[PDB]
Design a protein around this ligand. Structure first.
Ligand SMILES: CC(C)CCC[C@@H](C)[C@H]1CC[C@H]2[C@@H]3CC=C4C[C@@H](OC(=O)CCC(=O)O)CC[C@]4(C)[C@H]3CC[C@]12C
Lengths: 109, 289, 282, 210
């Protein structure tokens, strides 16, 4: 049973921490989504090749820890999303509706 | 133990990738579907092409030879489970997603699935959804019918496989052992157990997760799963350019099936278990042993 | 008319030994890869299989000529061997030439016109043109062979497939030989490969390095063909035209047989050039 | 058995007929967002039958499915090219276009299929950047340092350069960028020429000319 938890939320910097279990965290890459349901940023398998959404490059910062993903607030729900590909860097349906491999969200303002 | 087998007859003649194929009750006759839009019915033993019918839609994601053999179902990307008559008959409509798979319960009814999470059961002579199955959250990719047509399971992209009953129409239990898309499903010939191919480069067996297969060198997922006549072996096609043979009971690799110029698409097994045909994206249907 | 044929003993044996030990395994490898191309629905595979079997047939005659030159240019076997070895060593060259033209024309029709010429780029057409070439080969072979005067005897040494001075019929048919087997195939190869290079340089979806390697390969194959055949056919033409006496024949002897040795190098040039450079085998 | 033999012979008769008609036809895949007017480019499946220079093209539009598109996309690997259509006007979904193209580029099966990139709303992009209501640098700070009406051309080449960088970051399949609108009727010629180039490269690979 794949299942994800997150910690954080509340009035505003904040520690958006993702609690993941049930699958190999190292194999799959990660993504951030805000709600639109638009993608934010990703971290490759080795913690490099980081790319950002333009309205996120300056204000926000991400990091990866080996079963947890960290984002730091410098305004909506933040699901913690990952990609279905285990050993390749294609990723299609993170933005999709009713996508299973996504977080439950923390409300930040 | 260790099993090896080689190509016996190459059913060349297709123009595009053989994406799905199916056998009848008589293993001599097989139906091969390709994206070129041409359902060729091949005589296995004599390499003869007994029937060669054309198709309304080029894309064909599944083909169902009825056990009675009278009709053939051509489910493709089009939202229609076209049924052709031998010795076009109906145009089933109502699905909102691509026809991932189709299976004949008997002569007059068909059970199908869509790209949408909904799975449906039709009646051919009226074209009406007698039962509806809408418990999934991801795209349903494949079906699997037990020797008894009462139960069927529908592997979905949400890493969940839900077992359905045709009459009640409601799911009773769900499996979520996998961690990625499940694009291959096939009941074990005995009992309620069934295998699940997944894109996570791991195959797992489920029953009322209890088994898994994965090596470090394997970085590609599964594409098709089927068992033998007795189910001891587990032939699972792979994304890499060659098929792989697994053991249902043992975690080690029984052997390899190389010889395909592209990925395996569908790994059909004859009902009597006297042959195995692995339709590949090389437009060839090699029959092994 | 006695000819000092020391050039054979001094130069030919090493050329023949190298040609055998290089081409023969290379020819088998090229046949294997051509059959692999046959496995796919590729028409070029038929042409390479045909070319390499022709080159293997050319190899077959070489040990007899090696034993001949090592015997101080004296034929000893039965006249059947003389006839068949003459036919091979002096005609299979042209089968290979036409086969190269088939390869080049197939490549041109595929690359330059990827949408139109589909019926001709079919295995049926490849088999048809192959049968046509082999029928022409049989016609020329039965034309040459029926001439019982093919084998000569001078100074207790039997010279096979060579008359000093040239015979009337042999001289007359060397014009047809040179013309039909050089003039038209060379222009066909040039006209096909110029079009291929035009198509490659007009290609928009390929990087510059790969275009550079393609043009290098095309220049390599054209240079191989020209530098391997030009001297032999030019000297054959002058042998048929200018030569009218034994002294001229024995004077040209050395360059004639050196050019023939280059034509022997042809069949070790073909396999690597048409199969080994390609990245498919890698 | 002679009846079976003659029936079979007839079968490969119409099968070679079908083989030559099939090789006479080229398949295509049309992709894009809902706001992207791919139907204008055209002008279960929204089938299209169009031909140019006596070769038949079949451009297949998949509009009958849902958002999840990572599975039925695998059925289109045999196509000569993918007509990718981007509505770059709404920069909010332009990042979606980048992510979708990146997924296509790095997909296991699509690394062999060249993609035709069509920027579909260049008039709309020009009008939007002229208005300046939403700043491009806000949606992408890289435009505050990128260097080549000059501004509309700069924005258009920046948005195409994003996709081109994504493509070139990983030979084999190529990406052809193009600018199109609703009024352009020459999209068929662009598709035909790019498919011709793709088939030429496939022949180079096939005929051992590389
Ligand atoms: C008297 C003897 C010594 C003359 C020897 C020359 C012939 C062996 C060769 C040299 C050039 C060849 C000709 C050049 C080219 C062609 C085209 C070629 O046709 C193709 O390649 C079709 C390929 C395709 O479209 O699939 C083969 C026939 C032909 C007439 C060949 C026929 C046999 C020829 C005359």
């Amino acid at each position: 049973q794949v299942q994800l938890q997150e910690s954080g939320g509340g009035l505003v910097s904040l520690r958006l921490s993702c609690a993941a279990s049930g699958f190999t965290f190292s194999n799959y890459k990660m993504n951030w989504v805000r709600q639109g349901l638009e993608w934010v940023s990703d971290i490759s398998q080795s913690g490099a090749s980081i790319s950002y959404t333009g309205s996120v490059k300056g204000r926000f910062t991400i990091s990866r820890d080996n079963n947890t993903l960290y984002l730091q607030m410098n305004t909506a729900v933040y699901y913690c999303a990952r990609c279905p590909a285990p050993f390749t860097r294609d990723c299609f349906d993170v933005t999709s509706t009713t996508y299973a491999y996504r977080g439950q969200g923390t409300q930040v303002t | 133990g260790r099993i090896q087998m080689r190509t016996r007859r190459t059913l060349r003649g297709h123009l595009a990738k053989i994406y799905a194929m199916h056998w009848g009750t008589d293993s001599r006759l097989l139906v091969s579907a390709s994206q070129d839009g041409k359902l060729i019915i091949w005589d296995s033993y004599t390499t003869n092409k007994v029937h060669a019918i054309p198709l309304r839609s080029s894309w064909v994601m599944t083909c169902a030879y009825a056990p009675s053999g009278n009709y053939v179902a051509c489910g493709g990307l089009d939202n229609i489970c076209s049924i052709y008559n031998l010795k076009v008959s109906r145009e089933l409509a109502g699905h909102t997603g691509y026809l991932s798979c189709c299976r004949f319960l008997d002569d007059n009814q068909i059970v199908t699935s869509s790209g949408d999470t909904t799975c449906a059961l039709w009646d051919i002579e009226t074209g009406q959804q007698t039962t509806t199955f809408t418990g999934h959250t991801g795209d349903v990719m494949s079906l699997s019918l037990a020797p008894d047509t009462r139960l069927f399971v529908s592997g979905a992209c949400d890493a969940s496989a839900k077992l359905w009953d045709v009459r009640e129409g409601m799911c009773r239990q769900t499996f979520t052992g996998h961690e990625s898309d499940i694009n291959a499903i096939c009941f074990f010939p005995n009992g309620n157990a069934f295998a699940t191919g997944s894109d996570d480069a791991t195959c797992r067996l489920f029953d009322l997760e209890l088994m898994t297969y994965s090596h470090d060198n394997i970085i590609c997922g599964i594409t098709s799963v089927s068992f033998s006549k007795s189910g001891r072996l587990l032939l699972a096609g792979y994304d890499d350019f060659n098929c792989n043979v697994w053991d249902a009971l043992k975690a080690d690799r029984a052997g390899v099936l190389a010889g395909h110029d592209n990925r395996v698409s569908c790994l059909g097994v004859t009902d009597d278990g006297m042959a195995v045909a692995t339709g590949s994206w090389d437009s060839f249907l090699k029959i092994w042993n | 008319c006695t000819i000092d044929h020391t050039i054979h003993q001094t130069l030919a044996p090493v050329v023949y030994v190298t040609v055998l030990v290089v081409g023969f395994p290379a020819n088998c490898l090229s046949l294997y890869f051509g059959y692999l191309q046959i496995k796919a629905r590729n028409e070029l595979g038929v042409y390479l299989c045909n070319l390499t079997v022709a080159d293997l047939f050319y190899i077959c005659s070489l040990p007899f000529w090696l034993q001949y030159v090592l015997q101080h240019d004296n034929w000893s076997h039965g006249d059947l061997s003389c006839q068949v070895c003459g036919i091979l060593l002096y005609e299979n060259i042209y089968i290979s030439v036409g086969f190269l033209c088939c390869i080049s024309v197939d490549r041109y029709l595929a690359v330059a016109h990827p949408f139109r010429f589909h019926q001709f780029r079919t295995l049926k057409a490849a088999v048809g043109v192959s049968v046509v070439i082999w029928a022409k080969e049989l016609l020329t072979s039965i034309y040459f062979l029926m001439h019982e005067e093919v084998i000569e005897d001078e100074n207790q040494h039997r010279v096979c497939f060579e008359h000093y001075p040239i015979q009337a019929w042999q001289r007359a048919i060397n014009y047809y030989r040179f013309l039909v087997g050089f003039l038209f195939p060379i222009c066909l190869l040039l006209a096909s490969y110029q079009g291929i290079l035009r198509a490659v340089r007009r290609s928009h979806g390929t990087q510059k390095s790969r275009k550079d390697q393609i043009q290098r390969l095309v220049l390599s194959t054209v240079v191989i063909f020209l530098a391997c055949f030009l001297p032999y056919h030019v000297l054959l033409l002058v042998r048929s035209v200018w030569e009218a006496s034994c002294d001229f024949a024995k004077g040209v002897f050395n360059a004639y047989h050196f050019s023939l040795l280059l034509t022997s190098f042809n069949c070790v040039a073909d396999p690597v050039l048409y199969c080994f450079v390609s990245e498919t085998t890698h | 058995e002679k009846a079976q033999r003659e029936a079979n012979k007839k079968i490969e008769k119409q099968l070679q007929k079908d083989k030559q008609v099939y090789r006479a036809t080229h398949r295509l895949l049309l992709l894009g967002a809902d706001n992207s007017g791919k139907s204008t480019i055209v002008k279960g499946i929204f089938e299209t039958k169009f031909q140019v220079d006596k070769v038949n093209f079949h451009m297949f539009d998949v509009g009958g499915q849902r958002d999840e598109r990572r599975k039925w996309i695998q059925c289109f690997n045999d196509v000569t090219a993918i007509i990718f259509v981007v509505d770059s006007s709404d920069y909010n979904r332009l990042q979606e276009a980048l992510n979708l193209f990146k997924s296509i580029w790095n997909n296991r099966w699509l690394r062999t299929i060249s993609v035709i990139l069509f920027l579909n709303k260049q008039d709309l992009l020009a009008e939007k950047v002229l208005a300046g209501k939403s700043k491009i640098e806000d949606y992408f700070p890289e435009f505050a340092r990128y260097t080549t009406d000059p501004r509309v051309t700069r924005a258009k080449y920046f948005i195409r350069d994003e996709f081109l960088r994504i493509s070139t970051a990983s030979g084999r399949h190529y990406c052809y960028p193009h600018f199109t609108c609703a009024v352009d009727t020459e999209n068929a010629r662009r598709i035909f020429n790019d498919c011709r180039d793709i088939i030429q490269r496939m022949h180079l690979r096939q005929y051992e000319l590389l």
